[PDB]
Amino acid sequence: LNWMSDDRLSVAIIGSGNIGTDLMIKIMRNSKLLKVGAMVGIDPKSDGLARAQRLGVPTTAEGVDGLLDMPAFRDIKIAFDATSAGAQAIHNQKLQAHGVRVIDLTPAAIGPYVIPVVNFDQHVDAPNINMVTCGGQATIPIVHAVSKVSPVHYAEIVASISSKSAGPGTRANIDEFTETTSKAILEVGGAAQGRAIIILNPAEPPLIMRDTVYCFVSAEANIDAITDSVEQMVKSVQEYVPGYRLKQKVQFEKIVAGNEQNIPGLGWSTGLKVSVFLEVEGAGHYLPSYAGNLDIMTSAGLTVAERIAGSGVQVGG
């Protein structure tokens, strides 16, 4: 364990705005397995590039073509893409051609949706990994924790995000948020039916992100086991999202004959409604406290790269 021993996987961060820069800073502050080999941007004036060159990370304002010419590319084994879905289609083509793994923080959804605490292992070798949505990263862990104890016939999540912190891309394509998240609530969360709702609130004293998870399960679900699954899930997410916490105890509500609910997928139904009220505070070190919607994306992407790095050799073919 010598002074000079460097066994970290060099990663490249494509995108020099908020996501890329918070991801850069989060890797340097926390990761023991990764180093930032390059930050790839598009504008020499970006504050992200300024910060990177300040921290001594190689930079280019010439897109991924600029990256491919850098001396630093030789050891880049993982690329983060925090740009655009269309750009990632092109970025991924170039990067795969050099055998570089891609973790995609855009909606391109080229590779499988991954929620790391749920289904990372299933995708350990995936050459392209999609990070779904901030809501999906926040809530699918809870859906999965419930699903483990008892089948989730219907899961529904309500993301409440401060106006200030809502991503330009989410604003431009708010439908896509609800669709991608509910899609991933099925595939990865395990629910038979999926719903995602998003609210942007402009309160002064910007709001810490809230996520509410509703799971409909059969009347004979084990209430104590669900509570323990969820509380344990929360502890797992906290390993990479420290500000992720239950705002309220796990709540349970009996839906009993004479008060059937028209639960989609089923028809009228009786059973048990599980409500999990999450608060998700961002690390607040580069992105503010109320930007939990961004902070959970970079937290989730960092931890996917870290688990990639903890598997074994990085071979760029």
Partner: protein, 340 residues
């Protein structure tokens, strides 16, 4: 008396089968829709709004599941009317362009795309998609009391930019008096293209539903939202049959049958009311504290459940500045208060 043009047609948009969903926990049957839409249609209304309380795909744990889907409700109304347009309501973040397509295929020709009164920019895709379908596309700026006249007009302009043919001042909280309504229409008229229409969606929580809709007309408003008996969230919308009867005393060109609206209100709709759609301590709270009106019955359900005052839950919800669609926060507030 007033400076309203008694000759200008008031476009009459009924929301009995949409905002009124909130009064009936979204349990309107296909038969309620057909009977009420036919009655409204035969009384001369220009539009009848059909959707879950919270708009297309409002149905959820968050707002309450609906006895039927938007598609079946809209179809039922579309089929039962012969002159009125079937309107519907769409909240970005809840309903999507795909849900809008479905509602169009089912017979809706007006869509009101509703965002918080500071988030018009999330509505481009919906407003743009609706224009491409040749729908009357309207922009709804909810909780209009939380915005300044000038800011609200700036949001309205954005929605016009995207393709809105009409923009509504929305007193979702029922919190604004007549002067607030006037200042907002003036600000709207300064910036809107003269051809862009303008509309009023008052709630009755301070009993200004009718007064606010009239003063809107004095200030240039073209469309008035209302519903029979006020059937709607909170203390209700502008009571349609009352508004028309006052407008009639004023000689206003509303083009409705007063007595038919009056009788449908009493004979069809009010009987279906469970929790009374009126101004009382709990609905007053909505307007006093500026709280989204659909919160009313969920707040009262939490209040019964955790043995709290519904009034306090609502006031606290105002203090926290929750806005439309945030029903999950009602339980959040109730759980916090019970910890006492």
């Amino acid at each position: 008396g007033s400076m309203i043009d008694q000759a200008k047609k008031i476009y009459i948009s009924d929301v009995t089968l949409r905002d009124g969903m909130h009064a009936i926990r979204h349990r309107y049957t296909l038969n309620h829709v057909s009977q009420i839409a036919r009655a409204l249609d035969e009384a001369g209304v220009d539009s009848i709004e059909v959707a879950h309380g919270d708009g297309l795909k409002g149905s959820s744990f968050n707002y309450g599941f609906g006895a039927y889907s938007d598609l079946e409700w809209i179809s039922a109304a579309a089929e039962a009317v012969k002159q009125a347009k079937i309107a519907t309501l769409l909240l970005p973040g809840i309903g999507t362009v795909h849900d809008l397509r479905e509602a169009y295929d089912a017979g809706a020709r007006v869509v009101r795309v509703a965002t918080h009164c500071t988030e018009a920019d999330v509505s481009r895709q919906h407003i743009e998609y609706a224009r491409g379908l040749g729908m009357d596309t309207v922009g709804f700026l909810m909780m209009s009391h939380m915005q300044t006249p000038v800011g609200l007009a700036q949001q309205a302009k954005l929605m016009e930019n995207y393709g809105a043919q009409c923009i509504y001042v929305v007193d979702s909280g029922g919190a604004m008096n007549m002067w607030d309504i006037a200042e907002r229409f003036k600000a709207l008229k300064d910036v809107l293209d003269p051809a862009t229409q303008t509309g009023m969606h008052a709630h009755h929580n301070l009993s200004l539903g009718v007064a606010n809709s009239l003063v809107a007309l004095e200030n240039g408003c073209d469309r008035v939202d209302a519903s029979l008996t006020g059937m709607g969230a909170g203390a209700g919308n502008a009571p349609l049959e009352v508004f028309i009867a006052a407008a009639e005393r004023m000689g206003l060109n509303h083009g409705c049958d007063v007595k038919k609206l009056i009788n449908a209100a009493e004979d069809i709709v009010r009987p279906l009311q469970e929790r009374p759609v009126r101004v009382d301590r709990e609905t007053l709270a909505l307007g006093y504290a500026g709280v989204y009106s659909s919160f009313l019955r969920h707040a009262e359900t939490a209040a019964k459940k955790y043995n709290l005052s519904a009034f306090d839950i609502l006031v606290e919800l105002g203090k926290r500045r929750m806005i439309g669609g945030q029903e999950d926060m009602i339980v959040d507030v109730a759980l916090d208060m019970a910890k006492g």
